[PDB]
Write a protein that binds this ligand. Structure first.
Ligand SMILES: CCCCCCCCCCCCCCC(=O)OC[C@H](COP(=O)(O)OCC[N+](C)(C)C)OC(=O)CCCCCCCCC
Ligand SMILES: CCCCCCCCCCCCCCC(=O)OC[C@H](COP(=O)(O)OCC[N+](C)(C)C)OC(=O)CCCCCCCCC
Ligand SMILES: [Fe+3]
Ligand SMILES: [Fe+3]
Ligand SMILES: [Hg+2]
Ligand SMILES: [Hg+2]
Ligand SMILES: [Hg+2]
Ligand SMILES: [Hg+2]
Ligand SMILES: [Hg+2]
Ligand SMILES: [Hg+2]
Lengths: 309, 309
């Protein structure tokens, strides 16, 4: 069957998109028209049956009902595709951004407490939590320590859950979420625990689709970062814990060279006392170098819906 | 900045789609691969920003959260487009559709009370309800009256609300929903009330997207039909109440020539008595002609999620 290219279908696509209406947002109509066209065409080229179509419509309802659109998004590579575009654009402007950006993920929560230089991130409610001392220096576009920069960090516990999105409900507000303002040496230091990777809600729509593609929905253990400061663009990045089985097989394709960090294990008494911890702990060092604003503006900051508490 | 047609992105689409993956459903991979390719490309061609992208993702969540995917679908012309593909296929097979098909809509409910020849569809709970006597004849593929045919009818009240989907929740199950088995003369007859047209939930995602397209979301008063019988294909259609303002301006583009019917107003005491009514009533006559199975197969019956109570 071939009717997509006839005048009725073509005219119809213009009507449905409201390209004929006088009111509305021209930008939205432009996009809708393009998307309906490609889909109407895809339905023809692939001879998608009504049965298949409605299975797709039902899937769409499940996805939203389970608020998993922002989880399916990175799994189908959009999140990384948008980053790739951001990189292409910077490369075209001669911006040799040292610390590679990667996806933000849908689990950021605004409002975390902030402090200068140091902060313990966890409430110690994780029985299996392994103490982690994470620290580094923030450098400006010139390679100089940058005091006053705001480092935002958020990660999951050993069960792979983030505060505010813990299915088991446990967690205290902003647990494992802090904003650190760099100190006199442009440094930040936090005490938290090693996060574990995690997968998609096992019975959710995202996992359903992934099984159909013969793929897994697991992410390697990682820590999320937000770094902003005057005169510089906001940095969205993360670090992967070295040795994770999914380090290079992240379902969200967020991993990048330069972002995989080694968690050095310490067990000797001198190290333990020095960092005034209570037993063997792991240490990760990660410095971040920021890029300068582009003609006075942050050409790559993203404004997307983020939960605020 | 263009990266879509480079190797990296093209290989990325194959990976995200599970193409080189051994497990999974290749039909789904095929469709996903096509859809992703088109969306990645549309994003680049229309230079969609992350800000715009994430608003789209947010819309998808609320679309599903509100269980409105099946409502937007017809509003964006998919339901009708699929009917067109069906007509085209029937044409290619030489099947002359006497009674034109049209969209089912997302409001069908399975399990309605069943009766032979006659049925009263309402329970009187609608004040402004105006008595409507709808009756007709079902003809088999050879133009002869067909007894024991199953006619299913469903429609909204004067507030434009359907039972099972009534926000005010004052309707009893299956109100204005009935299955009628045709009598010895292949006839069906029901007593009900003239339905009112209806629109999209005003606060819902479908309505808001329609606003951005400068379109409305109203449908003219109509009555839905499902007609099935042994040896025949299941017919999905609906009749439009003549004179409705939106008759040829339905947001679901379901109106069709041959489906618009005139509600005759009867006020003579002799007619009111012959029809066992308590006063002035409206009458609508609509005969439907079925098509025979194709070699024992119903090549157009649609299997889609339908509420069953
Ligand atoms: C309002 C606008 C509407 C736009 C609609 C989108 C376009 C339509 C294309 C959708 C094509 C879907 C075809 C997939 C399919 O034919 O079947 C998909 C699987 C089913 O698996 P089966 O084993 O065959 O089920 C049956 C098992 N039995 C046989 C034992 C019963 O189920 C699933 O949920 C997977 C569905 C994934 C499709 C979602 C794509 C969205 C991504 C952006
Ligand atoms: C899981 C994978 C997901 C793949 C999805 C890819 C699609 C990406 C395209 C998204 C296009 C949306 C961009 C439109 C936009 O930038 O904003 C959309 C409107 C907002 O109104 P504004 O007035 O512009 O807000 C601004 C007010 N200010 C100016 C005062 C600030 O809101 C809306 O809901 C319209 C959004 C509807 C789009 C849904 C299409 C799906 C149907 C097939
Ligand atoms: Fe994460
Ligand atoms: Fe309807
Ligand atoms: Hg990449
Ligand atoms: Hg998973
Ligand atoms: Hg996942
Ligand atoms: Hg049409
Ligand atoms: Hg509406
Ligand atoms: Hg509507």
């Amino acid at each position: 069957v071939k009717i997509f290219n006839t005048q009725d279908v073509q005219d119809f696509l213009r009507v449905a998109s409201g390209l004929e209406q006088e009111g509305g947002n021209p930008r939205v109509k432009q996009i809708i028209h393009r998307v309906l066209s490609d889909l109407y065409k895809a339905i023809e080229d692939l001879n998608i049956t009504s049965d298949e179509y409605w299975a797709g419509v039902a899937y769409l309802n499940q996805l939203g009902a389970n608020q998993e659109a922002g989880l399916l998004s990175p799994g189908l590579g959009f999140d990384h595709y948008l980053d790739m575009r951001m990189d292409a654009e910077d490369a075209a402007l001669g911006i040799e951004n040292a610390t590679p950006r990667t996806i933000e993920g849908p689990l950021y929560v605004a409002g975390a407490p902030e402090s200068v230089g140091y902060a313990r991130m966890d409430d110690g409610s994780d029985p299996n939590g392994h103490t982690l001392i994470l620290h580094g220096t923030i450098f400006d576009a010139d390679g100089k320590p940058l005091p006053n920069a705001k480092v935002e960090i958020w990660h999951a516990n050993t069960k792979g859950f983030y505060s505010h999105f813990d299915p088991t409900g446990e967690q205290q507000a902003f647990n494992m979420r802090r904003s650190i303002i760099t100190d006199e040496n442009g440094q930040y230091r936090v005490r938290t625990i090693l996060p574990a990777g995690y997968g998609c809600p096992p019975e959710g729509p995202t996992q359903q689709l992934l099984n159909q593609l013969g793929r897994h929905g697991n992410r390697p253990a990682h820590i999320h970062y937000f770094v902003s400061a005057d005169g510089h663009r906001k940095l969205t990045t993360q670090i992967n814990v070295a040795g994770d089985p999914y380090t290079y097989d992240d379902f969200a394709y967020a991993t990048r060279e330069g972002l995989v960090v080694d968690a050095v294990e310490h067990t000797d008494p001198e190290a333990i006392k020095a960092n005034d911890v209570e037993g063997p702990f792991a240490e990760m060092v990660f410095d971040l170098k920021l890029t300068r604003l582009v003609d006075g503006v942050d050409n790559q900051v993203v404004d997307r819906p983020r939960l605020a508490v």
